[PDB]
């Protein structure tokens, strides 16, 4: 669908959930 993967309570309110940064951090560790 058009608007997938965006959480009204998080991404949309510009808020990060408690543990999502651990993912981001892990995606930059692979060089």
């Amino acid at each position: 669908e058009a608007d997938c993967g965006l959480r009204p309570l998080f991404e949309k309110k510009s808020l990060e959930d408690k543990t999502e940064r651990a993912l981001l951090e892990s995606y930059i560790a692979g060089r």
């Binding site: 669908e1 608007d3 993967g5 959480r7 009204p8 959930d17 408690k18 892990s26 995606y27 692979g30």
Partner: protein, 251 residues
């Protein structure tokens, strides 16, 4: 989910519970991928050794749920199923290769702060994110250990190299599978467990900042065991079929 934590409100709005109608019982997790399609593991519906052959008539889904033992009025939505589609080459006898199923909802579900679809990967998202050490997130109700929570549980786990995946088990693993979990030497623990199958392994694209479902909780040997890893249906490798049932069926 072993060694996870309570989900925060609206953390996993794509989360779907799959129920048997009568007697009613929570079977499996699942994910919402549009207002009308719900994705899950094929073994949740079809498993011949146990004479399991659940059909659209046998099943219910609940959407927007946070608490398994509290009816979430004006939040949770109960849906009936139009039809169920199991991957034709789902290998129930051996290794559960292509452990994937699609379910069409009778009527479209209304999106809220609590109900929202997850994205499906394209080739570019798969190529970039399906890499050793990259973390995905796994969610669900069902067993906290080998003991069933009332709040949705969440845990983050690193994808493991295919050689380590392959050597960890005597099961024959295919490219339609990948595995995730900590090694013994890493301190951390965590794994899906009984009740969690069908649930999503999601990743947050650093490219467009959307969550993608890259895997579906499929199988494992024990739960959270040293030197063992959870195995997940590899969603992008089966997009051809996924896109095809969605395209051909009803709308």
């Amino acid at each position: 989910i072993v060694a996870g934590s309570d989900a925060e409100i609206g953390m996993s709005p794509w989360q779907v519970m799959l129920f048997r109608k009568s007697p009613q019982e929570l079977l499996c997790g699942a994910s919402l991928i549009s207002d009308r399609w719900v994705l899950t593991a094929a073994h949740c519906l079809l498993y011949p050794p146990w004479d399991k052959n659940f059909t659209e008539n046998d099943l219910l889904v609940r959407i927007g749920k946070h608490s398994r033992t509290r009816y979430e009025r004006n939040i949770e939505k109960i849906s009936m199923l139009e039809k169920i589609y199991i991957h034709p080459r789902y290998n129930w006898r051996e290794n559960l290769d292509r452990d994937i199923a699609l379910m069409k909802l009778k009527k479209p579900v209304a999106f809220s702060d609590y109900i929202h679809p997850v994205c499906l990967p394209d080739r570019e998202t798969a190529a970039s994110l399906l890499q050793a050490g990259y973390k995905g997130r796994v969610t669900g109700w069902g067993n906290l250990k080998e003991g069933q929570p009332s709040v949705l549980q969440v845990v983050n786990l690193p994808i493991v190299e295919r050689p380590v995946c392959k050597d960890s088990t005597r099961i024959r693993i295919t490219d339609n599978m990948f595995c995730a979990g900590y090694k013994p030497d890493e301190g951390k623990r965590g794994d899906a467990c009984e009740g969690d199958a069908g649930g999503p392994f999601v990743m947050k694209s650093p490219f467009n900042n959307r969550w993608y479902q890259m895997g579906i909780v499929s199988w494992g040997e024990g739960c959270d065991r040293d030197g063992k890893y959870g195995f997940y249906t590899h969603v992008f490798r089966l997009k051809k079929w996924i896109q095809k049932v969605i395209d051909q069926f009803g709308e």
